[PDB]
Design a protein around this ligand. Sequence first.
Ligand SMILES: Nc1ncnc2c1ncn2[C@@H]1O[C@H](COP(=O)(O)OP(=O)(O)O)[C@@H](O)[C@H]1O
Ligand code: ALF
Ligand SMILES: [Mg+2]
Ligand SMILES: [Mg+2]
Length: 1140
Amino acid sequence: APLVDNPQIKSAELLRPLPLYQHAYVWPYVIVWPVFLRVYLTQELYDKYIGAQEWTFVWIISIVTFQTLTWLCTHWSVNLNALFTAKKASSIEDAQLIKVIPVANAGAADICKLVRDKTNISFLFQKRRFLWYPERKAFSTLEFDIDAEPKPTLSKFQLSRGIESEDELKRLEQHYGTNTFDIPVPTFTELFKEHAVAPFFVFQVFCVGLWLLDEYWYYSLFTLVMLVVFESTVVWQRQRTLTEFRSMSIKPYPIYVYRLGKWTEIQSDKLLPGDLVSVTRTKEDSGVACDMILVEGTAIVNEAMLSGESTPLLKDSIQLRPGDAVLEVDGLDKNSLLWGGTKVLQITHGPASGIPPPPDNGAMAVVTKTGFETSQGSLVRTMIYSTERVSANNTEALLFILFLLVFALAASWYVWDEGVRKDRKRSKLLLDCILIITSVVPPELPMELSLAVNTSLSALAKFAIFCTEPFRIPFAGRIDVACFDKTGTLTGEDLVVEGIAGLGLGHSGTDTPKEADGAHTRMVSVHDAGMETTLVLATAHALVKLDEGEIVGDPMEKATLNALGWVLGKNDTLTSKPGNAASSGILGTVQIKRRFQFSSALKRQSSVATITATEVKTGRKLRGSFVGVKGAPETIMKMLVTVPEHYEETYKYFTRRGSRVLALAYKQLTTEGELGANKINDLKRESVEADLHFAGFLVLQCPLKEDAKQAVRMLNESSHRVVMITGDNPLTAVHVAKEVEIVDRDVLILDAPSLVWRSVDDKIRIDVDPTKPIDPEILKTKDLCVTGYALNKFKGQVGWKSLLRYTWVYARVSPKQKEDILLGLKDMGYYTLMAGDGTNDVGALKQAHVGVALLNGTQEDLNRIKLGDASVAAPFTSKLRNVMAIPNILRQGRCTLVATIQMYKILALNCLISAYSLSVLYLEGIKFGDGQITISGMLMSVCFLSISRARSVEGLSKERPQPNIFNFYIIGSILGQFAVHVATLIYIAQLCDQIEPRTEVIDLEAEFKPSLLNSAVYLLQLIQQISTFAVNYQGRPFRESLSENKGMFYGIVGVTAIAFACSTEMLPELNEAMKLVPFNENFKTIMTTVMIIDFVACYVIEWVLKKLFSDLRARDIAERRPDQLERERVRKEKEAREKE
Ligand SMILES: Nc1ncnc2c1ncn2[C@@H]1O[C@H](COP(=O)(O)OP(=O)(O)O)[C@@H](O)[C@H]1O
Ligand code: ALF
Ligand SMILES: [Mg+2]
Ligand SMILES: [Mg+2]
């Protein structure tokens, strides 16, 4: 039943083409036209319904407008395109076009074209290839070799020899296509012809024609030029954005491919699935071209494109895997796949197919996916084409236009009534009414939200912050909860190894110092540690040495290797042959054989090695196989053969001061000799990580960043709420949150000893039940810290809705529970922001409304050298290590919202003034001069150019701007200022009528003549437009003030001075340039007083309404107790006093 089987495609229909003479805009008009021609050619029929020669133009324009509208309706809407041109088709045997309409907020619908090849029916939608499958009777996406419903056996990949037939090569090239990113940038002509059909560009040309019909030959040229240059700059912006998106692809580089039994040199854009390609060390500005699965050798890679981490990963082959009867899974073999867009740092070798090695001596891999179907390719394709636009709904600006159109319709109706009461000419009156109707619609009101976003993006890219989805910028103006991370986001990257603690557990030491609770205080340095501790520190690590001579890995592993004193070798060997205090004994060698890599959900890392070490002071020679494990103390505790007495108290005491505690464990498989080549590959993770003994805790110290406290204090006192979602110990997280002032009261930790409330000093213990609700006093008078175990056990009970509102510090959460917390906070109505820098938060970054991936990198790297280096893990990306980048996003979104509101108000108040001035001028039959209205338009354009310059303040304020148009701040201010302007204009028109009487005779001559009413109305409307620009400049509490910047203040002062000099008749040449009449002194004085009163009333109304209704209140989760407000006020007063 469904034609297209895809979650992101709603409807699809089959259509057939039709000839040109059968379209919906040919036959009805070709049957209507001869009827009108016969009516016009008939003399007796010409008198009735055609009238004079004037209404003939009206009928011709009407029929031509209907024909042009019918033609353009096929371009405006896809449904009308299918209805008019195309015709429904019965079966797939007779079909050439397909109408495809996607799901909401997933791009634009279209009419794709079927293609047939030899049987094989396919088409393209949003640069994605869909194929017709006759068995399922539906269209679906391409099916690859690794995505078969029965998972392929590993003998298919191990014994593969590449494509060996040229016919199969041609078939694969036809089926899948080349390995290129199809992102074409078109020229100016194509973009202009695509943009000159839009419904708001035809309307302005129609308005230009309407003005040209009324003998205005200087205004129409000016507005046509302005419209042309605006469309040109929009086209240039779109082309620049498309070029920036195009700059993400990888330039092709030569590679070696096994084809037809020989190693050939093929460019990187001519790769097909099933190829056997030799990989080597990649260069700068190049990555892996396509997704591959390794079959021989080992690689050391850096997957910075798909995750924010930059620590290298050790990919191994599937050569040793017994895949004769074992089906391939992606869970166990996740360490053998090379993704496209990553960099291969190192190739090491440490076959079943029976092929010679490649000439470049690289590893061998088998291609799996090519083109847009890779992970990076799919992410880029979704980013570019199928994404929500900046103004998706457009159901509020198009109603605001109708709101103005109601006023214009009322004015036009009154004009028509008062014109037909006095028996005026019907054609001129109809043209005046149409002009009044069409002179109220702002041209770019649907815009001015998609125009400020580009300026915000440029300002952000100044700060090295890049955004790939620009429709999330307004969301940053409404953030209510701002989540964070502990290690790598709020704490520094370098670590100092304090030492090894708890070596005396198990009654190893008798006179060791001990506190009241039983914790062992004494801490021993790494040099003076035991032999087993030294070997478990050396063995359980993932540090590799490049051929240049550098060491790369996790910072804590580099730190513990530097503190240990041992030296890394080329073939995964560590030795301490020199005898000195730097080696501190324990001399020997350690050679690693197999590694079980660290996983965030497992919280441990194990390693198997062959050791041969001796202790100098007490002998105790050791040799043979050995296995070392390091991880979180809670995880290691469950795997010990016997837990020592004071384990929990010791690690709790050592983590209470803010340190980081890692637990080590060791086991000896064989006492003498190696385990064996076959036995090593037969080991499993579950079997090797059991029955371990104990080694001392490694104690690290993570230093806080210099910008963490300032950024968090900026976020906290600006109607935001900041929470921490970490995976470290609850006590370390509580200490860090207390240091950065996230929590300021006593803290209670909800954790199993099941699910008890505990104090940080462990003097309060309260039992709670998962089913019963939380105690109200605990919520009222305590600060909460909810672990991962309690959050897991509170999955479906009633407590879940009350924890997420009263918890600021979540600790010990797996990467799935982070996205669980984010989804739970998003489902209650709040807006969330997440800032992470790791693979833990990748799931969480793609669920929050705003996602920042802090790519920790130095400024010197940028000085040595821009969407190429940016990743695709989060929509936002900052390339520096400063926490202050987060406020710089929430300030830019706020400025975007403020500028949008001010532009809406300015446009809506500038259109109505012109409409109701033309309405007043058309009651007496006189009209504006050509030069006067051209000068007014040029001055308004200059004012718009001058007011567009605006900067931002250096701090966040407590006032949140309104996010939408229909509030009680925009509507009320617009109506009040409109009423004031209307009252002043009506009063001055009545006074002009009183001073100079009207002859009530409108002659046939329509040549413009100078008059008092025309000059007064023109001067008043100019001054009113300038006052509207000067008053509604929304830049007092969020941007720079009006008088602080000369760029617009000088222009406003100059325009007002010129207008008042024209009013005061100081320059008669300027008065005669715009055809102004001489004034008497009393009229000049009364007009000046009227203008001053108008400006003062508008300013007072705007100020009152801004001070009353502009502030959108903070949510209930962001409200602060009076104690914190008092502390903030006291600290701010002290800072102000100590400033000078
Ligand atoms: N390279 C590593 N080797 C062993 N254990 C680690 C390593 N990295 C982190 N751990 C431990 O895993 C636990 C969970 O860490 P995780 O939540 O994955 O990241 P983070 O420590 O940034 O929150 C931590 O308590 C830490 O002690
Ligand atoms: F320190 Al983390 F997720 F990076 F808890
Ligand atoms: Mg992190
Ligand atoms: Mg990490």
